[PDB]
Amino acid sequence: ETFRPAGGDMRDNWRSELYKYKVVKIKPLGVAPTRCRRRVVGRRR
């Protein structure tokens, strides 16, 4: 097989540098089971 140079889409120039990056959104709220109730109790106290 033979290869030739291409330069049509500038996005490849940008992909060439950005490949090692990705952006995420942080999700600070979290919910989980626990032996802690509300009002007048946190398991006998």
Place this chain on the structure above:
Amino acid sequence: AVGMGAVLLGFLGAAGSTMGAASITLTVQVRQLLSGIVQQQSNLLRAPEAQQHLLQLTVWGIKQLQARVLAVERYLQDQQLLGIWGCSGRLICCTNVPWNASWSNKSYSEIWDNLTWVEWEREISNYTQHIYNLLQESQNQQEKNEQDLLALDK
């Protein structure tokens, strides 16, 4: 396990760590929600008035404003939520809502000593908003009970 001063610098530092260990780092994740990642060795002057021309309408100008407002837009949602769950100003808030095995039937240690939060949140991925709805439904059934109490209370 690192020091109290490093904990402050380690945003998402207990990401691959076990859920129980992540609790020392709750504040540091919270602070990022508005101010981004913390800066140590250098702390420049972040005051107002740095736009001295018509640069507020440019590409970056608009982009920055969008990023600035979105950042608080989102922060409030998380707060307002905690608020109508009755967990305002709490990084760890106990509720009245009992846990459901259908949501998950893991013991304490099966979770807290075995799972990472993102790992666990992926397990609870399905049942989350429904819980969010119970959390809020609880809060109301509380507020109802208070007015109930104010009626008998002369």
Place this chain on the structure above:
Amino acid sequence: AVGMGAVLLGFLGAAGSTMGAASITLTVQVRQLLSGIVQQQSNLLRAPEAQQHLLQLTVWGIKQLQARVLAVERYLQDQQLLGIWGCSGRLICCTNVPWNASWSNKSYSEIWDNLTWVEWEREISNYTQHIYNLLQESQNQQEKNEQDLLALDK
């Protein structure tokens, strides 16, 4: 009277209902202040980055930003107020301020079992900001008393 899950959906649903009945629906009014009216059957992806062109400076672009910021602008005022009354994170907050017959001389049931909130707020329309001023004046006379206490307390 409807269910706990419907209460969540019923924004302004106790508007014509009696004041005592409105308390189960406090959270649902609060949530609207930032997110607007809740959506049930459909819950699309509300994430960032939907402006892919120079559309942020158009009619709707500007309008949306104005509506977005105004929404939080107002939310904070309501919070900051509750805050300087010492009622932060409370949907029902007791105060130190005694009620005044001049404001209204209706019994509990004459209000809570007989009036709607907008109906009542129209009666208290005149004396409201003055109360808002007492609420705040109380909070200060509290903070004063604390510093007083910190002085005697060695």
Place this chain on the structure above:
Amino acid sequence: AVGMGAVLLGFLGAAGSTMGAASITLTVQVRQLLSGIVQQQSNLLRAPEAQQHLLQLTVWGIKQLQARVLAVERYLQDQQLLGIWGCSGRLICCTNVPWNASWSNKSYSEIWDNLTWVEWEREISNYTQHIYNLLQESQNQQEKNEQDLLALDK
């Protein structure tokens, strides 16, 4: 020493006054952070929709938006901070962090009956952010201890 109703109007009114006397005026400084200085004799209609043309992109139009957003931008930072110190909704909040003579070795009265806040904040100018870091490090060591407690608690 003035009245409770004047205290409300006197923004930065205990600026040259002694630190102990400034506590009655905490709320009035707080309210300014979002709404600016309070208005008494006149209270006009501050509702939305006053931009009836393409005036939102002009000099003042942009300037106002910048000032509006910056105002809340900053307010939240102060709140979020108090929050991760565990002092949410408190105008005076006690902590677990012990005072350090190196920071200052003045007695109560040597401070509260002798200094103005800006005067004192200038003395503590150096050691402030480090304290801000301890305040936050404390809060974490608290949250850690809670999860600790949730483990033994079955």
